[PDB]
Design a protein around this ligand. Sequence first.
Ligand SMILES: *CCC(=O)Nc1ccccc1Nc1nc(NC2CCOCC2)ncc1Cl
Length: 340
Amino acid sequence: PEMVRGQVFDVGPRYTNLSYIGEGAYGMVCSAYDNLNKVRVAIKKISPFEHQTYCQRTLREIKILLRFRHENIIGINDIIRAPTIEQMKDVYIVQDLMETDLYKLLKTQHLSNDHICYFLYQILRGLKYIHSANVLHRDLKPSNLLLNTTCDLKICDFGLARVADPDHDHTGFLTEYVATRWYRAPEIMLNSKGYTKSIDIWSVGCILAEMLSNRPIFPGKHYLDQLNHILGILGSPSQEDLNCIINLKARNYLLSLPHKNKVPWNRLFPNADSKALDLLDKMLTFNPHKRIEVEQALAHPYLEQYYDPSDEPIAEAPFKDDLPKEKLKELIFEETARFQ
Ligand SMILES: *CCC(=O)Nc1ccccc1Nc1nc(NC2CCOCC2)ncc1Cl
């Protein structure tokens, strides 16, 4: 078995000439030459079987990505694992090799208004498919958006995804930890479990703001500072929006704050296209019920050069917690069997 910086990376004989790329959420990722398709690919090594939560996340990532088939969602090209459950200690997921991620691109490159428009169109096009499958990504952020050399965008990492459940979305104040802090909708901190499609729209709004300025718009230093950054720009919520917050702890917290005025988007982003700012405003709406939906966002004038509903497909079959790690290991073994 081949080795990559003091760790086994057993993918041969199909995959050779390994090169370390970096560390993903669940471990080492390498690039390799696929001797069958004659191209370089990306290979993620996952070792999840000792922990139930690691098994849950790996199972979600695989089951979701194998069901999805969309130009703007990273696929799974192959899955490598031992022939028997007893010998399976790791799983290798093979995916198309991309040139960069939006996180890395935002750290060093200025994006033209044309690139912002095209990237936002592709994110929304992929999100339309995901949401049409009744799935919430729940961790949209720049590092989860891969780009190839021609700026084709692919959404990745469905390990934190959930089936939408708007009826069971209500919860207490300061309980929920959905998404990565900077991209977390205000309702997560107030009264939401993050089980509605509006959570993903918020994250996309955050990504759009970050493409406009190359800096996160709400860079909370910790969990409890996130809402302060949001309110610092959006201003105090209206009486109508507070009436939607029935939980007394969350409502009274918001009522205890001094009045804050809205910071105009045009002052925050003076170089931004006015149509981009109108859409940003609709995505970064405090009240989740008034927040724009993915299909409405695609139809916004900012995206008029790309908008084509006949070329924005939906899922053919939508998707409709305490399983021990032994059972989850068997389910991962069954879901990966097709690649043997
Ligand atoms: C879906 C997010 C993910 O897997 N990210 C990741 C983190 C670290 C290394 C590799 C990956 N995945 C990945 N990377 C690439 N290309 C790299 C090239 C170098 O710049 C970063 C992206 N291609 C595919 C995949 Cl799955």
